[PDB]
Amino acid sequence: CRDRIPQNVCEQMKKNGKCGDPRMSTIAELQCPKTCGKC
């Protein structure tokens, strides 16, 4: 399972720590399912 978007954009998402936060649970998944590791 890969991410529709590149790692360039998913990077900031990882450093931000939103992938784990509840506010960014669905968005972080659909946007970065691989980078966040939730697929």
Automatic annotation (TrEMBL):
Transmembrane segments: none annotated. Disulfide bonds join 1-39, 10-32, 19-36. The keyword Signal applies. Keywords: Signal. Residues 1-39 form the ShKT domain. This is ShTK domain protein. The chain holds residues 25 to 63 of 63 of the full protein.
